[PDB]
Design an enzyme around this catalytic site. Structure first.
Site, short mmCIF file in Angstrom:
data_model
loop_
_atom_site.label_atom_id
_atom_site.label_comp_id
_atom_site.label_asym_id
_atom_site.label_seq_id
_atom_site.Cartn_x
_atom_site.Cartn_y
_atom_site.Cartn_z
N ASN A 56 0.85 -1.19 0.00
CA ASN A 56 0.00 0.00 0.00
C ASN A 56 0.89 1.24 0.00
OD1 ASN A 56 -2.25 1.64 2.19
ND2 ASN A 56 -2.66 1.31 0.02
N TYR A 84 -8.37 13.07 -1.60
CA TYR A 84 -8.08 12.17 -0.45
C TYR A 84 -7.56 12.99 0.72
CZ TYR A 84 -5.74 8.59 2.39
OH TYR A 84 -5.21 7.80 3.37
N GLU A 121 -11.09 9.02 7.27
CA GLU A 121 -10.35 8.98 5.99
C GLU A 121 -11.40 9.14 4.89
OE1 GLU A 121 -8.82 5.09 4.77
OE2 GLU A 121 -6.92 6.04 4.23
N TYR A 177 -12.52 9.90 0.65
CA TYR A 177 -12.18 9.77 -0.79
C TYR A 177 -13.25 10.34 -1.69
CZ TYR A 177 -8.89 5.82 0.25
OH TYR A 177 -7.84 5.02 0.65
N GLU A 191 -3.09 5.94 -5.20
CA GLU A 191 -2.99 4.89 -4.17
C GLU A 191 -2.95 3.57 -4.91
OE1 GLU A 191 -5.79 4.95 -0.95
OE2 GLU A 191 -4.94 3.14 -0.12
#
Length: 183
Positions: free
Chosen positions: A34, A68, A77, A79, A170
């Protein structure tokens, strides 16, 4: 214009990221775990209008191109996903928002003891995921207020403490290349 460069990796695989001039960045990755790379602002704003042009976005497997960022108090978090590779991200369906000439599905998810901006924590994700992949190589706008106010309608309220806010590339267990300009 942009003031912040993000380059985070879990150290699995090869992620070669370049902080080019102005709002431009590039990343080449091979068999990553990641990573999150991107440009934007060290302090997010719910009213920010974000522009980008992805000169290239070619994930081989799982990769996202998104607005993001994070909030603290509490830890969320978030998106706004305009493009993806092999895997379209989903969670629990809350409804839809139409913004900047596209329709987005809205989802929530919980991550239990997961990597975060503040180490291993339990945190919530808020997602806007476009129903179709947005054009690559075009000057694209994200009117973030439309997403924040759509999320608010579903009880998806962001934290009171704003951390970074970026157009991020990502990867997850993938290889690929991206070249992106943000303003």
């Amino acid at each position: 214009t942009t003031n912040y460069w993000q380059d985070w990796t879990d150290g699995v695989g090869t992620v070669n990221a370049s902080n080019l001039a102005g709002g431009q960045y590039s990343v080449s990755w091979t068999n990553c775990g990641n990573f999150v790379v991107g440009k934007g602002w060290s302090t997010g704003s719910p009213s920010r209008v974000v522009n980008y042009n992805a000169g290239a976005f070619s994930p081989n497997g799982n990769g996202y191109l998104s607005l993001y960022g994070w909030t603290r108090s509490p830890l969320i978090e978030y998106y706004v996903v305009d493009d993806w590779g092999s895997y379209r991200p989903t969670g629990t369906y809350m409804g839809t928002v139409t913004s900047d000439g596209g329709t987005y599905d809205i989802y929530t998810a919980t991550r239990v003891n997961a990597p975060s901006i503040d180490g291993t924590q339990t945190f919530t994700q808020f997602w806007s995921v476009r129903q179709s992949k947005r054009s690559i190589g075009t000057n694209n706008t994200i009117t973030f207020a439309n997403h924040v106010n759509a999320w608010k309608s579903h009880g998806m309220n962001l934290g009171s403490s704003w951390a970074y806010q970026i157009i991020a590339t990502e990867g997850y267990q993938s290889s690929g290349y991206a070249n992106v300009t943000v303003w």
